[PDB]
Write a protein that binds this DNA or RNA. Structure first.
Lengths: 44, 50, 111, 114
RNA sequence: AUGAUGAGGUUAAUAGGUUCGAGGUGGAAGCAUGGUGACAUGUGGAGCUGACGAAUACUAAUCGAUCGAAGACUUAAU
RNA sequence: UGAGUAGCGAAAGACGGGUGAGAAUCCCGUCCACCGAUUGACUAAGGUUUCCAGAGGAAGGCUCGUCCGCUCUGGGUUAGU
RNA sequence: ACCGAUAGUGAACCAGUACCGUGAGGGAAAGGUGAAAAGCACCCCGGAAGGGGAGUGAAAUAGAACCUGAAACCGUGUGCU
RNA sequence: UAAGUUAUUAAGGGCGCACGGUGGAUGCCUUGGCACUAGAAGCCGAUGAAGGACGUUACUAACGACGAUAUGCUUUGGG
């Protein structure tokens, strides 16, 4: 049975990485919203 | 099926009446001096001599 | 006098130890030792070591003769359980209690 | 059958050939009571073949032993094991109870050649 | 099912083996002879044989330990 | 409480000798058994120290464990192609 | 004329962390020996764990599973039935 | 002999008390929170920000402090 999560490094960093979030305008807001919370992992 | 209703600690303690073990059924070996199981060998230093 | 010995947080369920503690409660000392030696139960060696400890405290801690003592008391209380799990079918998961016990033995010379 | 031992017919026959060979090699082995009551009837019928001593007996005994070295287990039979019981009739083994064992509570016996 | 209930525990036949039979299969290994050979024939209804009948202690039921009575009171009769 | 109840996850092990407080379950050995267009050999993802040697037995291991993919202590990855 | 560790911040603790999700995001639970560590030298049973003494202490059912220690629940002995 | 009546047994159970275990309520305490008052202050950044990664001690796993001058340096006052 093929499950929903197949791990992959390139896709993970190319969709959810810092550069991808710091690229668009609602990704800078995600970082600005995760920094305020105090999260120790902003993007990965 | 599921129990319809809880079991008292009277019913439980009654039903555990015959749930026990018995004394091992042992004799005294007339060489070792110590105790042993009848028809088995002397687990202490010794033999059977049957 | 009475001597006593305890073994705390023995890792055996208490109602498995109470089965073999009931065979030796009341008997003599050298008889109870052979009973604990010649029984199939897994809790026999533990109770045997606790009984030998209570028989050894009597010779040294309070001087008395070890050929007269009788097992005056022998019981097992509960102790802190351990909480483990077992993952069953369809995502569920059931509990597992790893019980422990405290075995106490008191030997007296009848005086 | 005579008595089953939790093994299927094939695994049981193999286990009995194994046990009888080990017994005639070492001459006293520690096993379980229920198997000691079954090797009793398989080793005693091999010493009868060893006491007959024909060539048809070597070949009808070769089909119940295993091929292990020591001599071979078939040469120890027809030699020493068959020379010492040349006047004894029957009762070539003896089983002794030792007691239950840890882990199974299975009565472990010793069986040897009398 | 387990126990229980039956046959027995050395002053013994209860089981296993071992000797002898019943029933089963169907004529063995080895050798000899006849064939180029596959094979056939002879000794020998042979030889193998779980549970069935008889006998024999050869081996194992050793040594030993537990439970279990002294018989209530009235009345009539003798 | 249900209750010492259901289960203990497809399958062939037997003995000998060790070690040890303790062995059906650990180490060595002989016999047997299983796969063999695969349960064998090599590598991409993906895991990320799980690899090795010396010690350990509280918890994990559906039992045991003197053992381990677990705990402790020291190590191990070498490019002009 | 605010709370007093189920309260008061989600967080009196090394918490926005174990973790859980592909991700945006969600989110706990965990306080207290003693006045001073004076935190049990030494002897005995045990392989160790754990005890029983003897000592520290005003107190050891104060021994780091540390103030007090209750109810459900689990046992051991017994008076009447 | 006869007729009749009655009792001890407790495998186990019920109630009452004595002594233990479990578990962590309650009492008392507080390293920290909540809601406010009066007075500073109400921006930092291309001279490289907020926020972080990696490192630094005789050991160092982590937290604070710090930055190849690294568990910190000089100098002027307090002590």
């Amino acid at each position: 049975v093929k499950r929903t999560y197949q791990p992959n490094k390139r896709k993970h960093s190319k969709v959810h990485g810092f550069r991808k979030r710091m690229s668009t305008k609602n990704g800078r807001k995600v970082l600005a919203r995760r920094r305020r919370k105090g999260r120790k992992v902003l993007s990965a | 099926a599921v129990p319809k209703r809880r079991t008292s600690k009277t019913r439980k303690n009654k039903r555990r009446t015959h749930f026990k073990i018995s004394v091992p059924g042992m004799t005294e070996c007339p060489n070792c001096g110590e105790y042993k199981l009848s028809h088995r060998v002397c687990k202490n230093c010794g033999s059977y001599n049957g | 006098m009475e001597a006593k010995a305890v073994a705390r947080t023995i890792r055996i369920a208490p109602r498995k130890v109470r089965l073999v503690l009931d065979l030796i409660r009341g008997k003599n000392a050298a008889e109870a030792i052979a009973i604990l030696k010649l029984t199939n139960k897994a809790s026999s060696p533990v109770i045997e070591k606790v009984l030998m400890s209570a028989l050894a405290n009597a010779e040294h801690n309070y001087d008395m003769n070890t050929d007269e003592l009788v097992v005056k008391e022998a019981y097992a209380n509960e102790g802190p359980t351990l909480k483990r799990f077992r993952p069953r079918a369809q995502g569920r998961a059931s509990a597992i209690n790893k019980r422990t016990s405290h075995i106490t033995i008191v030997v007296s010379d009848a005086k | 059958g005579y008595r089953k031992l939790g093994r299927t017919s094939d695994q049981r026959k193999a286990m009995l050939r194994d046990l009888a060979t080990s017994l005639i090699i070492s001459e006293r082995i520690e096993t379980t009571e229920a198997r000691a009551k079954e090797v009793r009837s398989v080793v005693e019928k091999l010493i009868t073949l060893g006491k007959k001593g024909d060539l048809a007996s070597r070949r009808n005994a070769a089909k119940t032993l295993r091929n292990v070295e020591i001599q071979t287990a078939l040469q120890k039979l027809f030699g020493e094991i068959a020379e010492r019981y040349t006047e004894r009739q029957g009762g070539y083994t003896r089983i002794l109870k030792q007691g239950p064992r840890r882990g199974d509570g299975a009565e472990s016996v010793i069986i040897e050649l009398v």
